Design a protein around this nucleic acid. Structure first.
Lengths: 105, 97, 94, 52, 80, 95, 81
DNA sequence: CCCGGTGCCGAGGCCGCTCAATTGGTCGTAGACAGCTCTAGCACCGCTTAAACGCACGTACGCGCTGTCCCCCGCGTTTTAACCGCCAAGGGGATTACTCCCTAGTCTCCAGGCACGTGTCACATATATACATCCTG
DNA sequence: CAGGATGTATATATGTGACACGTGCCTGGAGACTAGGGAGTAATCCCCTTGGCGGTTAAAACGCGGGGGACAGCGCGTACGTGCGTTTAAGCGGTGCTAGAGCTGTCTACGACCAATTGAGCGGCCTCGGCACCGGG
């Protein structure tokens, strides 16, 4: 009747998260609120990254998030950068930056 | 005739390739190299089309980071130009050596 | 065919919530799904390690909270913890 | 919302254009005849000697 | 076979441009080739080790992703 | 003594022993200082403090080993601040 | 407490550099080393206090420090029982 | 680099089915909480003194400058193959049949983990000449 | 091309810390012995995704020329090292006190578990429009 996602006010699949937690060998007993909490954290991070990438792609006259702007957002946000430090986004490119020493004048 | 001074076209190439998002290594040569390397690990192993692309993406990202650290080490020595010693120091600090 | 599965629908819903008009491509959607899966794996592993440390045979909301604290850098941790606690409080009231 | 495009030069005169192309016919025929005669009088297909 | 020269001077130069270098030495290409060869050899060894256990005749992007995660070079875009 | 001989002597001396190079009483107070910013009236075990001091000393030894090469890269014998800065940047701590 | 980072004196930092192989040390290297050590201890002790508070304990055990160092990548033997 | 035109295939929305999420119901067990305690963490104070702090002096190392020599950099033309489509077929995956391996439970039993006291058994600290190992002449 | 003048080994010794070794406890383990479950191995077989053919231009490559950058030599200056003297708080270990980590004992709500029901999600398909491509300013 009521999905736990809508019950908690979340969009992510609390039920799928609970299933994955109890089937991933993480523990022998998954708390009632553990999957809700995990889904909430995942939704928060996803909303952050999606908003940043959206307004990074819309800053380039586009209307569709692409890997380039996803990478731009992930590398411009100091928190998301520390989070996904050793991660590489395919087709993301690099940040435009030329060292002053290499630059002329 | 007309030719640019040394340092004008390099900056243009940098500004271009730093915004362009496309594999710089040649696809078929990289695939042949991957097959060569896998031959010394197991004979007659097949590779999915996406596996070679993923390997190329990862290798290009690794080399881009390595060249960034190499340029940093080169500038540390008051040298605008990079050289194998810069890659050596970059890897040494990274912990790969 | 099989049934490969992903959070594409929920990612798209959150994308609509944050930017009602800004879409997302298939490559970007796959990258976001991979990111979500990796974060899930890391948080769940950290929660299981915390449970093993505390000798608890269960991973609870408090374990998830501490795992998020041990992974997110500062303001991100403080915001994710607030989101999780609010979600669990709203869930417990229904 | 600062910049904007522009366009101009909307002129094409039917009869004057017909005259202009009937004139360009002169240049076309001159080019054809010049190319033909120059080829026939210069190429005269053959070869040359070696430079040792 | 010895087809390691497929990673040529122009490709290494474009990689350097993307990495932000504006001037390359004459002995950088032979060093970059060896570094890339070692990195590949490692990742492909891990991928083949996964494939052997998987009993699959075809190496998969999933195995490549697992090898990258083992080496610490996590990659997003290929289902992991 | 010539500047450098008594320094190479100390190098060979401290690359031979294994005792702690930082003083306990001063380092435990720093540990409690940094812990105050996280929890008031926090207790620490002697083993925990010793493990913290060991980790700090090992990290600093590695950092100075990298800084030595960073300095030698510039044909310099003395380590300057930009050397430790480059070390940290290439390590990924302050990139 | 306060200003206990100054409990890492120039002789101590110079011994730490001698053990790392450095021969000659500059003046600001000591301040740089103090600042880096403080930043490292900040993260290590934050992880330790996060492992402690979660356990409802009032004492930071050695296993908490070990787990913090493992998280930070500095696996430390000799204090794991 | 920016702007107007065309164009196409990949994004995004609809259809439909199913399998996972959900609802209802039970057992039990890990945990929450209070009770007790005894170790260890905390505080303090004095005798000892090794390390730290401050200052003087000069010597050698940073660093700035200059000069040569070349080794990359930009541009033109020349040669190789990466790249974009068809065509077998070789494998990656659905579908069915079936057994060795592990689960679960309950006794029976070898083994290791300390509390304690006893007896060996390193090498830290101390002492000295022998050896470098300098550095000023 | 020496020699005071330090510093660094090298070897020997001993007795107090610590491995080392019984002596019995037992309780958490370790294995043996029935009974039950179950998922993946094995054999087919349908079906896409590889690997293999011939062209097209686009990028790799070869060369050239000179120009700006690396590397070596050299010198000026100052600061970083070493030594001496004064100062301070670090190490020691002796005593006092209580705070809470830990063991423990009891009672209990939460979740694994099992069965039935339902709709959220996902493969699939099609229509369409955001941005790839492009040639003039």
């Amino acid at each position: 009747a009521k999905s736990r996602s809508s019950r908690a006010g979340l969009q992510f699949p609390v039920g799928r998260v609970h299933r994955l937690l109890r089937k991933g060998n993480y523990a022998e007993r998954v708390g009632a609120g553990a999957p809700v909490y995990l889904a909430a954290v995942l939704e928060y991070l996803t909303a952050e990254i999606l908003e940043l990438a959206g307004n990074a792609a819309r800053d380039n006259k586009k209307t569709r998030i692409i890997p380039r702007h996803l990478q731009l957002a992930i590398r411009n946000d100091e928190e998301l950068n520390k989070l996904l430090g050793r991660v590489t986004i395919a087709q993301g490119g690099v940040l435009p930056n030329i060292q002053a020493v290499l630059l002329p004048k | 005739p007309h030719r640019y001074r040394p340092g004008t076209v390099a900056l243009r190439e940098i500004r271009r390739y730093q915004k362009s998002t496309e594999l710089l290594i040649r696809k078929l040569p990289f695939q042949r190299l991957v097959r060569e390397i896998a031959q010394d690990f197991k004979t007659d192993l097949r590779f999915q089309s996406s596996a070679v692309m993923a390997l190329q993406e990862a290798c290009e990202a690794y080399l881009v980071g390595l060249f960034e650290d190499t340029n940093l080490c080169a500038i540390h020595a008051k040298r605008v130009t990079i050289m194998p010693k810069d890659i050596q120091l970059a890897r040494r600090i990274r912990g790969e050596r | 065919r099989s049934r490969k599965e992903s959070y594409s629908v929920y990612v798209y819903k959150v994308l609509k919530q944050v930017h009602p008009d800004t879409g997302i491509s298939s490559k970007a959607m796959g990258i976001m799904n991979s990111f979500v899966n990796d974060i899930f794996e890391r948080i769940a592993g950290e929660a299981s390690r915390l449970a093993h440390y505390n000798k608890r045979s269960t991973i609870t909301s408090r374990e998830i909270q501490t795992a998020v604290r041990l992974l997110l850098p500062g303001e991100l941790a403080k915001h994710a913890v607030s989101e999780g606690t609010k979600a669990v409080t709203k869930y417990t009231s229904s | 919302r600062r910049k904007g495009p522009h366009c101009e030069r909307p002129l094409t005169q039917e009869e004057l254009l017909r005259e202009a192309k009937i004139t360009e016919e002169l240049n076309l025929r001159s080019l054809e005849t010049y190319e033909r005669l120059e080829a026939d009088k210069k190429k005269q297909v053959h070869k040359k000697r070696k430079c040792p | 076979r010895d087809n390691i020269q497929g990673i040529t001077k122009p490709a290494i130069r474009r990689l350097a441009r993307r990495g932000g270098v504006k001037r390359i030495s004459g002995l950088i290409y032979e060093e970059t080739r060896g570094v890339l060869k070692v990195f590949l050899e490692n990742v492909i060894r891990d991928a083949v080790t996964y494939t052997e256990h998987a009993k699959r005749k075809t190496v998969t992007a999933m195995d490549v992703v697992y090898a990258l995660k083992r080496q610490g070079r996590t990659l997003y875009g290929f289902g992991g």
